Amino acid sequence: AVQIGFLLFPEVQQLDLTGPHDVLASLPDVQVHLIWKEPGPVVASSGLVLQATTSFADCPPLDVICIPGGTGVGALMEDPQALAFIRQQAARARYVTSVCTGSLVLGAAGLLQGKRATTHWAYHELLAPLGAIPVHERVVRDGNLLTGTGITAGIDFALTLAAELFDAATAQRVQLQLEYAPAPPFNAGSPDTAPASVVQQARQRAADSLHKRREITLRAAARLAA
Amino acid sequence: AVQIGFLLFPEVQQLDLTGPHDVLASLPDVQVHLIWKEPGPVVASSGLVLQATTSFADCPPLDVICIPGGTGVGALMEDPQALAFIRQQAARARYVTSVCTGSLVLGAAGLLQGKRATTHWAYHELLAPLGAIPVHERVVRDGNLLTGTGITAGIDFALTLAAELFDAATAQRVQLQLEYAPAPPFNAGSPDTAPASVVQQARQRAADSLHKRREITLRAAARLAA
Ligand SMILES: [Cl-]
Ligand SMILES: [Cl-]
């Protein structure tokens, strides 16, 4: 059975995780884990309560690891236990993946050094200090690393992983079973397509978070430099 | 505060719910409820454990009600307590909505009689016996009813509801904040675009479920005929 694991942490953006979870859980001969320091309740940034299924120490060797993003990424970038777990699993995983600001956690763990990667548009400047080659594309692959932008990045890249772990017909069948054919009613999902006034509002609302994450990123980079 | 409620039931397809939940929970001055017979754990069809936040009796009057789909829809179509709750809330709600097979629950409650509606492609033949005018479109509006197809239907229609409850700029800001710009790597999300061999596989895998739901639908229709 293919072993797939998601890191589940306080203040996660839950859709970053629950999207790919439902897609990948639809495949035959997979087992999906929700990993934290101990099994039990973990609260997402919206207040939704989720349950972790396994601890770091009890998690099996993973074939796929996925790091979601969210407010809670800042704490995780300086959590030595979580970073060590990610490094251990990444060493043998077939696919190391992240959604949105989850790539900043991979960066803090040292897994983006010399690698092409993306992250959420408002935090993209934090990739270079973590050693990455920043790329402004929605899905960026470098070897076995796959970083994706947008809250539903993991739904799309889960179909790619299905095709590569199984075959294209299996990925197509899952897409059809889920009737997955998005059609957003607005075209404002990128700073290059949204109205300038909307981009300003969004940047202003992210400014305090970006400031705090600049500080965290520099401390994380100092640890990598040692 | 706008009151938004999702029905959370055993064997729900969790993404049908968790997608619109994270979008709508991002708006100012909303309160989101996860409703079942009592607060506490409810297990989705994938095994993911979610928590209901309120009972039927304690739920406030809702401005928006959303019925997700999933395996568990069959039981809900013959649950008199759940159907009565849906009818009570629909009477005063500004928006009555569903995702995927959630529209079959609205049908069992009598809320599709004479109304245009859609549902998941494999179960579309069950709409007419519930009194609906079946429509093969991804999002179908009829008055204050909004039925949508696909596991992520509620992400897209949540942006529509944001624009109508607030304004277009608010919907665009949320889309940008979430960097929501899907791009599926395959084009098999409709029986009209998927390869014929894939459609056959998917129809065969749904056949036992469709048979059981034909029986349930006829009993539900008999109750409406009384
Ligand atoms: Cl997206
Ligand atoms: Cl969809």
Secondary structure (H, E, C), chain B: CEEEEEECCCCCCHHHHHHHHHHHCCCCCEEEEEEECCCEEEECCCCCEEEECEECCCCCCCCEEEECCCCCHHHHCCCHHHHHHHHHHHHHCCEEEEECCHHHHHHHCCCCCCCEECCCHHHHHHCHHHCCEECCCCEEEECCEEEECCCCHHHHHHHHHHHHHCCHHHHHHHHHHCCCCCCCCCCCCCCCCCCHHHHHHHHHHHHHHHHHHHHHHHHHHHHHHC
For residue B37, what are the contacts with CB-CB under 8 A and spacing of at least 6? B55, B56, B81, B82
How far is B171 from chain A, CA to nearest CA, in Å? 8
Q: In chain B, which among 79-118 make CB contacts under 8 A with chain A?
A: 100
CA–CA distance, B99 with B97 (Å, rounded to integer): 7
Q: How far apart are the first and last CA of chain A?
A: 38
Distance A189 CA to ligand 1 centre (A): 8
Resolution in A: 1.2
From CA B98, how far away is CA B147, in angstroms rounded? Answer: 5
What B213-218 contacts at long range (C-beta under 8 Å, 24+ apart), as own/partner pairs, is B213/B73, B213/B74, B213/B104, B213/B123, B213/B126, B214/B126, B216/B74, B216/B77, B216/B78, B217/B77, B217/B104, B217/B107, B217/B108, B217/B126, B217/B129, B217/B130, B218/B129
- Strands B95-99 vs B64-67: parallel, antiparallel or unpaired: parallel
Q: CB distance from A188 to chain B under 8 Å?
A: yes
Look at A186 and B171 and tell me if their CB atoms are within 8 Å.
Answer: yes
In angstroms, the CA A95 to CA A145 distance is 6
Task: Read off the CATH number of the domain in which B184 is found.
Answer: 3.40.50.880
Among candidate residues A44, A77, A100, A104, the one labeled active-site is: A100
Q: Do residues A178 and B150 touch, judged by C-beta distance below 8 A?
A: yes
Q: Is B100 a catalytic residue?
A: yes
Q: How far is B226 from chain A (nearest CA, A)?
A: 34
Residues in chain B: 226
Strand partners, B49: B43
CA atoms within 13 A on the CB side of B135: 19
Q: Tell me the shortest Cα–Cα distance from A154 to chain B, in angstroms.
A: 10
Classify residue A55 by its DSSP letter: E
Give which of B71, B69, B114, B65 is closest to B88, Cα–Cα. B65
Question: Which helix (H) or strand (E) segment is A159 a member of?
Answer: helix A153-165
The C-alpha atoms of residue A34 and residue B50 are separated, in whole angstroms, by 13
**CA–CA gap between residue A119 and residue A98 (Å, rounded):** 9
CB B147 within 8 A of CB B106: yes
Three-state secondary-structure class, residue A219: helix
d(CA A123, CA A217): 11
Contact at CB, A155 and B152, closer than 8 angstroms: yes
Q: Do A77 and A129 form a contact (C-beta atoms < 8 A)?
A: no
Cα-to-chain-centroid distance, residue B203? 21
Q: Give the whole-angstrom CA distance, residue A98 versus residue A157.
A: 10
Nearest to A198 by CA among B81, B39, B170: B170
Quickly tell me which residue has 């989101």 as its tokens.
B32
Residue A130 DSSP class: G
The bound ligand whose nearest atom lies closest to the alpha carbon of B152 is 2
Q: What is the DSSP letter of A5?
A: E
Please, is A226 exposed, middle or buried when counting C-beta atoms within 10 Å of its C-beta (0-12, 13-18, 19+)?
exposed
Q: Are B111 and B145 in contact (CB under 8 A)?
A: yes
Residue A181 per-residue DSSP state: -
The two three-digit tokens of residue A2, written as one number: 């293919």
Q: Do A172 and B194 touch (CB under 8 A)?
A: yes
Taking only Cα atoms into account, the Rg of chain A, rounded to an integer number of angstroms, comes to 17
Cβ contact B15–A22 (<8 Å): yes
Which DSSP category does A51 fall into? E
Q: Which ligand is nearest to the CA of A148?
A: 1
Q: CA separation (Å) from B79 to A112, A148, B49, B83? A: 52, 41, 21, 6
CA of A219 to the centre of ligand 2 (A): 41
- Asked if B184 lies within 8 A of A152 by C-beta distance, the reply is no
Which residues, in sequence order, are CB contacts of A225 under 8 Å at separation 6+? none
Number of structural domains found in chain A: 1
Ligand nearest to the CA of B190: 2
Which residues between 154 and 173 in chain A have a beta carbon less than 8 angstroms from any beta carbon of chain B? Answer: 155-157, 159-160, 163, 168-169, 171-173
Q: How far is CA B97 from CA A112, B5, B101, B141, B217, in A?
A: 42, 10, 11, 9, 20
Cβ atoms of residues B185 and B157 within 8 Å: no
Which is catalytic among the residues B4, B73, B99, B100? B100
CA-CA distance, B19 to B155, in Å (whole number)? 5
Assess contact for B49 and A28: CB atoms under 8 A: no
Q: Do A18 and B18 touch (CB under 8 A)?
A: yes
- Contact criterion met (CB below 8 Å) for A96 and A5: no
Q: Which residue range(s) make up the domain with B184? A: 1-226
CA–centroid distance, B191 to ligand 1, in Å, is 23
